[PDB]
């Protein structure tokens with residue numbers, strides 16, 4: 017297993033960019049510190065600058081649900097670019113993707129495209145505050161909602177990975193209009209509403225968390241949140257930037273039947289390109305400029321290249337037996353991992369819903385970030401490296417969810433379980 | 444002049460998206476009438492959905508400096524996408540573009556790629572604060588640096604155009620750390636420092652304004668800002684998202700010879716795709732994760748498509764004669780436009796620097812946002828519609844700098860002048 021080229025490239029990288037990467041988690045800091053540099057990706061695999069091929073489970077952090085470099089997506093894009101990549105004025109494609117999104121996600125009656133999930137979350141917070149006229153927002157420990165000021169407090173992703181705390185460039189004057197509660201603690205939320213009456217704009221959360229590892233909500237949690245916010249004239253916002261189009265076509269809101277007032281989408285909606293969106297009830301979206309006073313803009317928003325990738329990705333997911341296939345192969349891989357762990361003497365817990373799974377090195381059960389924190393990270397680090405050497409690419413962090421795509425085959429799942437066996441028979 | 448198809452598509456867009464647009468500036472709310480729905484763009488032209496062709500002076504709001512659908516850029520993107528559009532892991536292309544940016548921009552010693560200008564500006568906002576340990580920030584009235592909460596105070600771009608007030612939805616609590624002052628007023632700046640000792644983190648400005656029309660700094664203003672920030676151990680931040688790579692290869696800071704501590708990049712750096720960036724002194728950039736404590740992540744940051752686009756675009760600009768051609772053809776346009784205004788009996792002023800220019804319907808001169816606000820908005824509204832019917836596309840606002848490209852020819856200039864004469868002869 018040679019990584020000569022990855023090593024020299026990442027070495028040179030550190031002198032040019034902060035930590036040598038464009039996003040923190042790619043530095044491999046909580047798993048050894050030696051990242052491999054990619055050259056190309058195809059279907060369910062990835063290739064090294066050294067020639068090594070891996071079966072990918074990161075899937076570029078959500079976007080590749082259809083598989084890397086889908087033939088029909090890049091051909092649609094090769095055709096689109098001969099007409100220019102960015103116009104700066106409206107184009108017909110915005111209208112089609114927009115209509116597709118309205119039909120797809122329940123709560124969305126009107127949309128606004130942006131360039132990333134971060135931008136969509138910045139916008140949705142401002143909108144929920146503007147619509148209500150209140151300033152307090154209730155967020156949950158372990159939920160990532162983009163690298164924004166108001167939300168860098170017990171967030172997810174790298175925050176809930178390398179033990180990053182609150183603030184990072186944001187003052188106490190920003191992270192003070194944001195109340196925090198433990199994920200799944202319906203009672204703690206009620207407390208915050210009774211403790212700060214008439215001043216909570218709303219609650220925002222990942223309906224299913226993937227940024228503190230995979231954590232599913234309990235029996236009547238989401239239903240609880242919908243009712244309590246209602247009783248107080250507060251807005252319920254679902255950050256489905258990761259869950260959207262993966263858990264189901266209409267996301268977690270469709271799968272579990274709880275409808276929020278606004279939702280945010282990103283990742284899969286751009287099909288592999290920088291795109292995001294925020295939408296919800298009509299009367300609320302009416303406040304967004306130019307239709308309203310709340311300002312939010314973006315030079316590259318709605319660009320045709322992005323709209324093209326977006327539309328092709330949704331046409332492919334709308335086909336017969338898409339999610340059934342994801343639930344099927346992902347259940348086999350998840351159950352298979354937990355079985356191998358049990359027979360090798362390793363304590364573990366996990367699960368999956370459609371093409372999103374989780375696996376933790378602790379008996380659990382995991383109900384929140386604190387529970388997630390009791391995992392043996394030293395074992396995870398060794399597990400991750402071993403899997404890497406066996407040709408399987410896993411998220412370099414215990415606090416990230418795993419992903420599956422329509423290009424993963426039954427055989428691909430069988431080889432992964434085979435590697436997991438050879439590996440867990442060490443540690 | 445027919446715009447039936449544009450009218451059909453827009454009327455539909457309004458039922459799907461707020462104001463039927465993805466960005467507030469695309470709305471013809473102030474320039475009268477409805478927007479023109481584009482179909483394709485190439486070189487110096489754009490074609491709407493009804494067949495009308497136009498000589499483009501908006502250049503997708505900045506990115507199209509080499510011209511729309513540049514053949515050398517799109518073929519490079521075709522080859523690239525074959526390898527996958529996003530990796531979610533390091534790629535060698537990030538090193539190449541990073542190395543090009545350090546070389547290009549004087550103050551940049553270390554860079555971090557982000558997906559937009561709004562993102563670069565939000566990140567730098569946080570860094571100024573993390574590095575200095577101070578909370579307050581000085582920004583100028585009429586300038587624009589994205590829609591991050593703290594910047595939504597006396598902003599330019601679409602807020603100006605639509606006559607929108609500061610904010611809605613951004614807590615008073617956060618808005619209070621933003622100190623504002625009129626552009627070109629060195630004394631108001633010194634007053635703000637002397638009144639908030641040890642509290643100002645720094646000053647952020649568009650070195651050459653393009654968001655409240657085209658405004659150049661008065662002699663000594665930038666050198667003065669450099670002086671007074673060094674003296675109170677505060678940061679000098681240049682928002683070069685629009686000026687970068689346009690005013691000169693190294694932007695205004697290279698052109699006018701004043702070196703800041705941190706600068707933000709966007710538009711042209713993406714080459715038509717969504718890309719942004721921020722960088723500056725190494726010791727300041729070291730605070731960014733995973734090297735320092737300040738957390739800033741991005742799923743699509745550094746993706747291979749965007750890197751390829753930027754790499755190719757910067758290679759075209761690096762060629763000899765680039766900025767000289769841009770200056771030459773923009774000078775004729777600016778001068779010509781001014782000559783026609785005088786000759787047809789209209790009060791007007793403006794100017795140009797390389798590929799950026801402005802034209803106001805006021806005697807002038809313009810030194811700040813208030814000055815710019817005196818332009819005859821009704822005359823511009825009629826002049827815009829007139830130019831539109833003659834086949835010339837200008838930004839639908841008096842508060843937007845106009846742009847030029849390497850694809851515009853002497854003939855396109857002459858045809859625009861011929862059109863300006865015809866339109867201005869009525870009014």
Ligand SMILES: *Cc1c(COP(=O)(O)O)cnc(C)c1O
Nearest residue numbers: 132133134161162257258741742
């Ligand atoms: C990844 C993520 C984001 C951030 O979007 P980017 O594209 O990285 O800006 C926001 N919310 C959730 C739930 C995420 O998974």
Ligand SMILES: *Cc1c(COP(=O)(O)O)cnc(C)c1O
Nearest residue numbers: 314315559560561588589684685
């Ligand atoms: C356009 C602009 C921005 C905002 O950048 P986007 O890419 O629209 O998100 C920031 N700074 C300046 C000066 C701008 O011209």
